[model samples]
Target: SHMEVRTIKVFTTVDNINLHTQVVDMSMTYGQQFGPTYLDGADVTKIKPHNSHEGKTFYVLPNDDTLRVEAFEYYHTTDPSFLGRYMSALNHTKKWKYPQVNGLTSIKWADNNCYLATALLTLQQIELKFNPPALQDAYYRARAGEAANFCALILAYCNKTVGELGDVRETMSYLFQHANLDSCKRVLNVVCKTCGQQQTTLKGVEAVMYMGTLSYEQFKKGVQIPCTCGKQATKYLVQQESPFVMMSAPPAQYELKHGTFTCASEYTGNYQSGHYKHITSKETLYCIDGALLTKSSEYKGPITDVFYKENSYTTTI
Candidate 1:
């Protein structure tokens, strides 16, 4: 088969003037520009002539003069927490997201229950029963002063003329923006009358210091504002009625009973529609479906015959 010749059978059909099919040996040079094929198997337009396209191949996109190609990469840092530690670090680098400081930049509300702590710092007419004249005077001064001045007032209140200093500006600024009940206890060293040992506390209606980003309007509803000892409702305005006095009643007879009772105990005047009532040693009435059913008073055996007692659901062991 060294000198054998091969023939490739091809059927050419031109059904329409727009459809013309041609076959050419790929190894031979075409008279017009040809050889490399379009990826979509479209017919090539002979705009130019070339020689010796045999044994050569090319891969190219469609000739779209309107399209342009470009390559690019986006760079970003993941360590936003580290970057945010220093303002200069965050300013220089391209971080994915910048971390937020709560009191300084963002609005953060103190806990709903921490009214005494937030009020002490915010209110102008606040009174502390424990520290009377000297400490009270210092508190008023510290509340109005700058960050450094506030720190000096605290040091003086602690009976220390000079002591080790922390980040006064940042700490005081943070305290101003995000101070909660615990912040007052630790930073300002003031105890809450309700949460702590202090007995009497008073918080005025007005504020003297700037409450920059602190939010308290939302927590005002359904939260108590002033401290009332023994968990009593205080003279200071609060939202919900603390019905703690009702809790002082016996467990079986609390004041806050709910639901409608179709039937009630004849003697105790409690709900009996779905409860068991002991009449005597020989008689017990289990009420179900507003009907009274009798059983042995000492619970001699299973008492679930009264229409599978809905409320008295005992284990079926």
Candidate 2:
């Protein structure tokens, strides 16, 4: 294979919603380029020569093949002026302060560009740091606790707020739970076709029937709700869904209870949900709706396997 030197336009997204562009000069062999690592937090998506019409300022979204019309850019992983040189320089200076673990270097050099390990330790430290003489300890502890979950990671990676993660469980369950068709529920409004009057609310099995899970003929046979206009409200129309399946309240409530695992939020005289943690044999518990569930990662084994010698295979002794 031969090497070629060229300039390319690179597009990346840091927070997933916003895009950043860079012009890079690099050497490549075949389809591969060497040592043009992205900024710590950036997820590079596209590399190409700029079209003649490309303006000095513009954006390319991850989903669209065409460039978006704009002369301004959005979220960035690092300072565009310095091209992250400042952060790298500071990292080099501060490298010596960190201790090695199992042949691994500083936590700053760990996976997710030093976020995962550092955040874990940070979460542990804040358990005490947020503690005050007043009852505010729980508040900070809850903050720390949520950080231990995917909350902090998602925020750093995608700029997703805690409430924005409400759909995460749904999306994940859809992927892992065989599509969970049975658990999927929707509200259907049954109206009278003859009189155009509202009839009844249909959900669960009856609702699925209207959605073709059962034959239309079967639905026609089963629905017998009457409309106020004295006709059968067999025509299903607009409807409202109940609360989410697992989350009894809003996403904010799930987030608060997920971390705090306490009734402290209830002291304000609201009939709020609760969480729980063992006082003695300590393992963090997770909360759903209002109740605590067992810790998801219950394995007591060491997680040291995540660490490995970086670039070891590429080195020639």
Q: Give one digit per residue, the lDDT tens place, for model 1 in 1-317.
A: 45443222222211111212344443333323233332111223231212332222321221222111100000011222211121222121112111122111111121111111122222222222222232234344434432222322233222222312222122223333322222121001123446663322222211111121111222222223344544533121122211100000111321111121111111122232122221111113222211123432222221211100011111121
Q: By TM-score, how accurate is candidate 1? A: 0.14
Instruction: Enumerate clash totals for all models, in the order shown.
Output: 0, 0
lDDT string for model 2 (18-108, tens) is 4556564543321143122333322222333334413233222323322222211221223232222322332332332333322222232
On lDDT, the leading prediction is 2
Q: Measured by TM-score, how close is model 2 to the native structure?
A: 0.21
Model 2 per-residue lDDT at 258: 24
What CA RMSD would you report for each candidate?
Answer: 31.7, 20.1
Name the weakest run of 10 consecutive residues (lDDT summed) in model 2: 303-312
**Which residue pairs in candidate 1 have backbone atoms (N, alpha carbon, C) closer than 3 angstroms, thus clashing?**
none
Name the top TM-score candidate.
2
